[PDB]
Design an enzyme around this catalytic site. Structure first.
Site, PDB file in Angstrom:
ATOM      1  N   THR A  11      28.014  31.935  47.553  1.00  0.00           N
ATOM      2  CA  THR A  11      29.181  32.559  47.557  1.00  0.00           C
ATOM      3  C   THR A  11      28.530  32.895  45.951  1.00  0.00           C
ATOM      4  O   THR A  11      27.769  32.972  45.441  1.00  0.00           O
ATOM      5  CB  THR A  11      30.675  31.414  46.534  1.00  0.00           C
ATOM      6  OG1 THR A  11      31.119  33.252  47.097  1.00  0.00           O
ATOM      7  CG2 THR A  11      30.466  31.663  45.806  1.00  0.00           C
ATOM      8  N   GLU A  12      28.703  34.784  45.393  1.00  0.00           N
ATOM      9  CA  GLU A  12      27.976  35.258  45.159  1.00  0.00           C
ATOM     10  C   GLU A  12      26.373  35.424  44.711  1.00  0.00           C
ATOM     11  O   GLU A  12      26.064  35.936  43.734  1.00  0.00           O
ATOM     12  CB  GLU A  12      28.524  35.250  43.553  1.00  0.00           C
ATOM     13  CG  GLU A  12      30.214  35.621  43.377  1.00  0.00           C
ATOM     14  CD  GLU A  12      31.063  36.291  43.771  1.00  0.00           C
ATOM     15  OE1 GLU A  12      30.462  37.514  43.640  1.00  0.00           O
ATOM     16  OE2 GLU A  12      32.059  35.953  44.161  1.00  0.00           O
ATOM     17  N   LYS A  15      25.523  39.489  49.204  1.00  0.00           N
ATOM     18  CA  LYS A  15      25.668  39.839  50.287  1.00  0.00           C
ATOM     19  C   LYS A  15      26.399  40.830  50.790  1.00  0.00           C
ATOM     20  O   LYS A  15      26.001  41.886  51.728  1.00  0.00           O
ATOM     21  CB  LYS A  15      26.293  38.331  50.568  1.00  0.00           C
ATOM     22  CG  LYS A  15      26.547  37.902  52.615  1.00  0.00           C
ATOM     23  CD  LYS A  15      26.999  36.614  52.813  1.00  0.00           C
ATOM     24  CE  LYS A  15      28.402  36.728  51.564  1.00  0.00           C
ATOM     25  NZ  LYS A  15      28.625  35.585  50.498  1.00  0.00           N
ATOM     26  N   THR A  16      27.181  41.739  49.623  1.00  0.00           N
ATOM     27  CA  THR A  16      28.116  42.957  50.837  1.00  0.00           C
ATOM     28  C   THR A  16      26.936  43.964  50.448  1.00  0.00           C
ATOM     29  O   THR A  16      26.154  44.460  50.377  1.00  0.00           O
ATOM     30  CB  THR A  16      28.988  43.063  49.607  1.00  0.00           C
ATOM     31  OG1 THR A  16      30.585  41.575  50.196  1.00  0.00           O
ATOM     32  CG2 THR A  16      29.949  44.216  49.950  1.00  0.00           C
ATOM     33  N   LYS A  37      34.188  42.510  58.277  1.00  0.00           N
ATOM     34  CA  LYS A  37      34.337  41.326  57.170  1.00  0.00           C
ATOM     35  C   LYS A  37      35.689  40.609  58.131  1.00  0.00           C
ATOM     36  O   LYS A  37      36.715  40.846  58.358  1.00  0.00           O
ATOM     37  CB  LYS A  37      34.090  42.120  56.157  1.00  0.00           C
ATOM     38  CG  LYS A  37      35.350  40.796  55.119  1.00  0.00           C
ATOM     39  CD  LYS A  37      33.102  40.107  54.201  1.00  0.00           C
ATOM     40  CE  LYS A  37      34.468  39.320  53.156  1.00  0.00           C
ATOM     41  NZ  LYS A  37      33.291  38.038  52.417  1.00  0.00           N
ATOM     42  N   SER A  41      39.407  36.919  51.720  1.00  0.00           N
ATOM     43  CA  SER A  41      40.078  35.924  49.994  1.00  0.00           C
ATOM     44  C   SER A  41      39.823  37.082  48.766  1.00  0.00           C
ATOM     45  O   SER A  41      38.254  37.133  48.842  1.00  0.00           O
ATOM     46  CB  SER A  41      39.433  34.568  50.623  1.00  0.00           C
ATOM     47  OG  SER A  41      38.440  34.655  50.014  1.00  0.00           O
ATOM     48  N   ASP A  54      34.794  43.998  49.414  1.00  0.00           N
ATOM     49  CA  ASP A  54      33.713  43.630  50.205  1.00  0.00           C
ATOM     50  C   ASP A  54      34.006  44.416  51.546  1.00  0.00           C
ATOM     51  O   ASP A  54      33.126  45.519  52.006  1.00  0.00           O
ATOM     52  CB  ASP A  54      33.824  42.526  50.300  1.00  0.00           C
ATOM     53  CG  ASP A  54      33.360  41.734  49.721  1.00  0.00           C
ATOM     54  OD1 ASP A  54      32.291  41.983  48.816  1.00  0.00           O
ATOM     55  OD2 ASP A  54      33.014  40.051  49.931  1.00  0.00           O
ATOM     56  N   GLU A 115      30.281  39.981  58.108  1.00  0.00           N
ATOM     57  CA  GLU A 115      29.742  39.518  57.410  1.00  0.00           C
ATOM     58  C   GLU A 115      30.372  38.232  57.089  1.00  0.00           C
ATOM     59  O   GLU A 115      31.400  38.582  57.405  1.00  0.00           O
ATOM     60  CB  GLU A 115      30.576  40.146  56.133  1.00  0.00           C
ATOM     61  CG  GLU A 115      29.368  40.308  54.558  1.00  0.00           C
ATOM     62  CD  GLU A 115      30.053  40.963  53.384  1.00  0.00           C
ATOM     63  OE1 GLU A 115      29.327  42.696  53.542  1.00  0.00           O
ATOM     64  OE2 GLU A 115      30.468  40.753  52.608  1.00  0.00           O
TER      65      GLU A 115
HETATM   66  N1  LIG Z   1      21.184  43.902  42.936  1.00  0.00           N
HETATM   67  C1  LIG Z   1      21.650  43.600  42.613  1.00  0.00           C
HETATM   68  N2  LIG Z   1      21.306  44.179  41.449  1.00  0.00           N
HETATM   69  C2  LIG Z   1      22.137  44.234  40.306  1.00  0.00           C
HETATM   70  N3  LIG Z   1      23.743  43.020  40.594  1.00  0.00           N
HETATM   71  C3  LIG Z   1      23.888  42.815  41.823  1.00  0.00           C
HETATM   72  C4  LIG Z   1      23.093  42.799  42.727  1.00  0.00           C
HETATM   73  N4  LIG Z   1      23.146  42.593  43.957  1.00  0.00           N
HETATM   74  C5  LIG Z   1      24.400  41.614  43.699  1.00  0.00           C
HETATM   75  N5  LIG Z   1      25.132  41.952  42.051  1.00  0.00           N
HETATM   76  C6  LIG Z   1      26.314  41.641  41.927  1.00  0.00           C
HETATM   77  O1  LIG Z   1      26.907  40.370  41.820  1.00  0.00           O
HETATM   78  C7  LIG Z   1      28.127  40.235  42.579  1.00  0.00           C
HETATM   79  C8  LIG Z   1      28.196  39.792  43.754  1.00  0.00           C
HETATM   80  O2  LIG Z   1      27.569  40.966  45.148  1.00  0.00           O
HETATM   81  P1  LIG Z   1      28.264  41.091  46.408  1.00  0.00           P
HETATM   82  O3  LIG Z   1      29.991  41.097  46.197  1.00  0.00           O
HETATM   83  O4  LIG Z   1      27.149  41.811  47.240  1.00  0.00           O
HETATM   84  O5  LIG Z   1      28.067  39.221  46.559  1.00  0.00           O
HETATM   85  P2  LIG Z   1      28.462  38.130  48.366  1.00  0.00           P
HETATM   86  O6  LIG Z   1      28.422  39.104  48.926  1.00  0.00           O
HETATM   87  O7  LIG Z   1      27.503  37.225  48.112  1.00  0.00           O
HETATM   88  C9  LIG Z   1      30.178  38.106  47.067  1.00  0.00           C
HETATM   89  P3  LIG Z   1      31.355  36.689  48.280  1.00  0.00           P
HETATM   90  O8  LIG Z   1      30.950  35.109  48.582  1.00  0.00           O
HETATM   91  O9  LIG Z   1      32.951  36.828  47.989  1.00  0.00           O
HETATM   92  O10 LIG Z   1      31.823  37.799  50.177  1.00  0.00           O
HETATM   93  C10 LIG Z   1      28.850  41.444  42.653  1.00  0.00           C
HETATM   94  O11 LIG Z   1      28.984  41.571  41.042  1.00  0.00           O
HETATM   95  C11 LIG Z   1      27.200  42.214  42.163  1.00  0.00           C
HETATM   96  O12 LIG Z   1      27.860  44.474  42.394  1.00  0.00           O
HETATM   97  C1  LIG Z   2      36.230  33.668  47.115  1.00  0.00           C
HETATM   98  C2  LIG Z   2      35.145  33.569  47.395  1.00  0.00           C
HETATM   99  N1  LIG Z   2      34.113  35.086  46.171  1.00  0.00           N
HETATM  100  C3  LIG Z   2      35.333  34.091  48.668  1.00  0.00           C
HETATM  101  N2  LIG Z   2      35.440  34.846  49.404  1.00  0.00           N
HETATM  102  C4  LIG Z   2      34.845  32.980  49.400  1.00  0.00           C
HETATM  103  C5  LIG Z   2      33.748  31.615  49.731  1.00  0.00           C
HETATM  104  C6  LIG Z   2      34.553  30.589  49.779  1.00  0.00           C
HETATM  105  C7  LIG Z   2      34.022  28.807  49.445  1.00  0.00           C
HETATM  106  C8  LIG Z   2      33.881  27.795  50.018  1.00  0.00           C
HETATM  107  C9  LIG Z   2      33.733  26.382  49.362  1.00  0.00           C
HETATM  108  O1  LIG Z   2      32.140  26.411  50.392  1.00  0.00           O
HETATM  109  O2  LIG Z   2      33.538  25.923  48.782  1.00  0.00           O
HETATM  110 MN   LIG Z   3      30.624  39.748  49.674  1.00  0.00          MN
END
Ligand SMILES: Nc1ncnc2c1ncn2[C@@H]1O[C@H](COP(=O)(O)OP(=O)(O)CP(=O)(O)O)[C@@H](O)[C@H]1O
Ligand SMILES: C[C@H](N)[C@H](N)CCCCCC(=O)O
Ligand SMILES: [Mn+2]
Ligand SMILES: Nc1ncnc2c1ncn2[C@@H]1O[C@H](COP(=O)(O)OP(=O)(O)CP(=O)(O)O)[C@@H](O)[C@H]1O
Ligand SMILES: C[C@H](N)[C@H](N)CCCCCC(=O)O
Ligand SMILES: [Mn+2]
Lengths: 224, 224
Positions: A11-12, A15-16, A37, A41, A54, A115
């Site tokens: 997570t984080e 991916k978006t 998507k 959550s 997202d 996603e």
């Molecule tokens: N290329 C980059 N440069 C700077 N910041 C970045 C980045 N890629 C991602 N981030 C930052 O890291 C955080 C997570 O980004 P993103 O929302 O795309 O990830 P993710 O989709 O894995 C989260 P989730 O698990 O909730 O889907 C955000 O605050 C985003 O702006």
């Molecule tokens: C809330 C978060 N940013 C994502 N929407 C969901 C992450 C679920 C993680 C479940 C786990 O593997 O522990």
């Molecule tokens: Mn995301």
């Protein structure tokens, strides 16, 4: 339609951000694109109901004008695992609703990006995970790797599980979640050598708002 | 001797904290214990050469008085992947040296805990990973899970890969890396349900210096 599922090493990891880049490259190639998507959550309250950031990013990077609920049928306010908040709310996440939604997008788009939520094994109920639905749909998978210490192990774990499920790992995207560090190049060479799928491109560290940045240029759609 | 390999869901989840707890419980059961950290990166300079903090913790929690090099044969200064710094230095990490070291400990201890570096798939050379040596040694594996968002996916990925390698997953340890959060209990129930190995115990969040804390009481060695 071409269809792809985007997952991350954690997570984080961006991916978006990588999904928006992919959607921008597909639009530039001439595809009618739609982001999907199914489950989200961590949502804000608005006059129209809950909206997830997202899903809003996927909706505004699609070349078709789509309604919010078409992009994100299941929206939960609390940023936790989908299965915890679903049971809390008394709103089951149904595999038939997730699949019907994908078909609806396919009536209008010819390049659809799906996603997931979290990483590969995110639970959707007590007997069903996101991985089970992706296997069921036979979606090819694109792995997003945030380049940081610990990412070689997470990229290899996710790559092997997908392949053991008999799914195609279509490619991977390197996302630079921190500023340039000392072992960047060696990390990129090890990841290239070890992930059995083409590197589609590298998104650089972008301090301010990277999901609104024009990042399509960092993706080579030709390898997908 | 009983022998166990300790791995984590990621780097920095409390693997050395849980290893010290395990070593303290084994000593309390009456075993002659030895901690083994074959490979370490991220080390301080001293008059005696490089010393790694994890290896120092394992050395001081063993019931036998052991010399530093017996506990940690390969010590690298830079906190990066072992294979990058090994090639940089011109000091190959040899599987025969790692195995000989384990045998040496077995001459004197009857309960030996081996701590890896990073997570499961940490590369030791360009054709050899830590996972390859553990499979080669047929060590049963104890998984340490830092309880945080994203840990269900990482615990399931690591559990499946170990089992696909034909190794025994001996048990898992829950480590509370943050203060009490809102979905602690539901996270613990999902992890118990999904990891196919006994929960050995839960180490609470300990602000000040947890590797020096007396934590043996949180481990039930009876399930190992
Ligand atoms: N290329 C980059 N440069 C700077 N910041 C970045 C980045 N890629 C991602 N981030 C930052 O890291 C955080 C997570 O980004 P993103 O929302 O795309 O990830 P993710 O989709 O894995 C989260 P989730 O698990 O909730 O889907 C955000 O605050 C985003 O702006
Ligand atoms: C809330 C978060 N940013 C994502 N929407 C969901 C992450 C679920 C993680 C479940 C786990 O593997 O522990
Ligand atoms: Mn995301
Ligand atoms: N129960 C707990 N309460 C508070 N802090 C904890 C904790 N468990 C671990 N930590 C802290 O988290 C950090 C990582 O702990 P630890 O060294 O045991 O993990 P680890 O062995 O996975 C790291 P490496 O990948 O380098 O081996 C340390 O600063 C440690 O003190
Ligand atoms: C330096 C760190 N604290 C550990 N010693 C080693 C982590 C290696 C991680 C390799 C990777 O999976 O990216
Ligand atoms: Mn450690």
């Amino acid at each position: 339609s071409k269809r792809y599922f985007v997952t991350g090493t954690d997570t984080e990891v961006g991916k978006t951000v990588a999904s928006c880049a992919l959607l921008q490259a597909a639009k530039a190639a001439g595809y009618r694109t739609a982001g999907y998507k199914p489950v989200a959550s961590g949502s804000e309250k608005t006059p129209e109901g809950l909206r997830n950031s997202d899903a809003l990013a996927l909706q505004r990077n699609s070349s078709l004008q789509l309604d919010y609920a078409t992009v994100n049928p299941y929206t939960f306010a609390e940023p936790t695992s989908p299965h915890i908040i679903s049971a809390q709310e008394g709103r089951p996440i149904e595999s038939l609703v997730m699949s019907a939604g994908l078909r609806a997008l396919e009536q209008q788009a010819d390049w659809v990006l799906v996603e997931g939520a979290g990483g590969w094994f995110t639970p959707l109920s007590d007997t069903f995970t996101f991985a089970d639905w992706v296997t069921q749909e036979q979606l090819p998978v694109i792995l997003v790797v945030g380049v940081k210490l610990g990412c070689i192990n997470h990229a290899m774990l996710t790559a092997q599980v997908i392949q053991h499920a008999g799914l195609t790992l279509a490619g991977w995207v390197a996302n630079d979640v921190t500023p340039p560090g000392k072992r960047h190049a060696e990390y990129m060479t090890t990841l290239t050598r070890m992930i059995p799928a083409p590197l589609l491109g590298e998104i650089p560290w972008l301090a301010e708002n990277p999901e609104n940045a024009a990042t399509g240029k960092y993706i080579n759609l030709a390898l997908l």
